[PDB]
């Protein structure tokens with residue numbers, strides 16, 4: 717069984733076989749999303765990921781290796797098999813390494829690296845290649861709000877016209893300021909009680925998030941979750957904290973018109 721999708725990652729750019737060339741060994745790169753065949757990836761039961769009839773292929777199996785296009789039958793079986801874990805990683809199970817966009821720019825070549833749960837290692841397999849713009853509603857049915865670069869995020873009464881309450885949910889599993897998409901919801905550290913702020917997107921593990929099945933927003937590296945500090949909205953502090961199941965750790969996205 718198979719299905720075809722784009723693969724969206726860092727900065728909303730897509731996995732692209734350079735200029736539609738399919739010569740074995742051509743590096744895969746980031747490029748703005750489109751519908752051309754060199755961004756259309758077919759996922760099959762054999763765990764291959766194919767474009768133009770050739771495979772997404774690990775050029776070697778150690779950290780820092782290139783990912784390239786390659787003839788499926790002549791490439792090593794270990795090099796051409798991939799899985800897609802629920803948290804947005806794309807993993808080569810033979811090596812345990814994960815697909816990585818080591819820099820943000822278009823034309824960045826993609827690498828296989830040790831998983832560090834970086835935003836540079838988050839991907840979304842989808843035909844919708846535009847970020848989803850949403851409100852993020854939490855404790856006391858208030859809305860998460862941005863308050864400028866380098867400042868804390870916090871909760872306020874929802875307002876449909878408030879630009880500061882609008883979030884672009886990018887394919888790399890980042891949560892961006894919708895009006896200023898170079899800025900990311902960022903934990904200022906990986907320890908319990910570290911503050912959530914807005915910082916320039918830099919592909920960091922502190923900028924990667926996962927909306928889990930329990931209503932939590934999880935930072936995969938820390939394992940900790942977004943938390944309205946001390947269940948007190950007047951503190952105007954959102955932190956990471958261990959998952960407790962409490963209402964101050966529950967969030968829902970609401971798509972905006």
Ligand SMILES: *[C@@H]1O[C@H](CO)[C@@H](O[C@@H]2O[C@H](CO)[C@@H](O[C@@H]3O[C@H](CO[C@H]4O[C@H](CO)[C@@H](O)[C@H](O)[C@@H]4O)[C@@H](O)[C@H](O[C@H]4O[C@H](CO)[C@@H](O)[C@H](O)[C@@H]4O)[C@@H]3O[C@@H]3OC[C@@H](O)[C@H](O)[C@H]3O)[C@H](O)[C@H]2NC(C)=O)[C@H](O[C@@H]2O[C@@H](C)[C@@H](O)[C@@H](O)[C@@H]2O)[C@H]1NC(C)=O
Nearest residue numbers: 778779780781782816817818819827828829830831832836
């Ligand atoms: C798993 O594989 C990963 C991908 O290869 C490894 O990550 C790389 O590790 C490289 C080091 O081995 C690292 O390269 C160096 O990066 C230095 C910093 O560059 C940044 O900052 C610069 C400003 O100061 C800026 O210009 C850059 O754009 C970067 O933002 C850089 O200074 C180093 O260059 C010095 O030394 C070289 C000599 O080798 C000089 O040529 C250079 O002028 C300068 O004097 C160096 O850059 C590399 O230089 C050689 C060139 O061929 C390379 O292309 C160039 O990158 C590189 O940044 C990262 N890449 C990524 C994606 O992170 C990873 O290594 C580890 O993790 C990194 C972050 C680092 O902490 C390493 O020490 C860790 O080992 C691998 N994992 C493991 C466990 O090995």
Ligand SMILES: *[C@@H]1O[C@H](CO)[C@@H](O[C@@H]2O[C@H](CO)[C@@H](O)[C@H](O)[C@H]2NC(C)=O)[C@H](O[C@@H]2O[C@@H](C)[C@@H](O)[C@@H](O)[C@@H]2O)[C@H]1NC(C)=O
Nearest residue numbers: 855856870871944945946947948949950951952953954964
């Ligand atoms: C919830 O957050 C509020 C903002 O920090 C707290 O109010 C502040 O409490 C301070 C005590 O450390 C006190 O000096 C301040 O006067 C007060 N207000 C501001 C704007 O700083 C609040 O503290 C308690 O609850 C409210 C209802 C007030 O009665 C306070 O005086 C209480 O100490 C925080 N705590 C709770 C549990 O609500």
Ligand SMILES: *[C@@H]1O[C@H](CO)[C@@H](O[C@@H]2O[C@H](CO)[C@@H](O)[C@H](O)[C@H]2NC(C)=O)[C@H](O)[C@H]1NC(C)=O
Nearest residue numbers: 846849850882883884893894895896897972973
């Ligand atoms: C979120 O930000 C986006 C991107 O800036 C806004 O979408 C743009 O809006 C203008 C006016 O409608 C359009 O001309 C552009 O084509 C849009 N750009 C992109 C990149 O799609 C949008 O208004 C913002 N707010 C919401 C609720 O999405």
Ligand SMILES: *[C@@H]1O[C@H](CO)[C@@H](O)[C@H](O[C@@H]2O[C@@H](C)[C@@H](O)[C@@H](O)[C@@H]2O)[C@H]1NC(C)=O
Nearest residue numbers: 738740768769770771786787788789790791
């Ligand atoms: C991968 O390499 C093998 C052997 O070196 C080629 O036979 C493949 O050729 C392709 O598949 C066969 C079925 C035939 O239709 C041929 O015309 C195709 O090009 C090659 N695979 C590709 C996609 O280049």
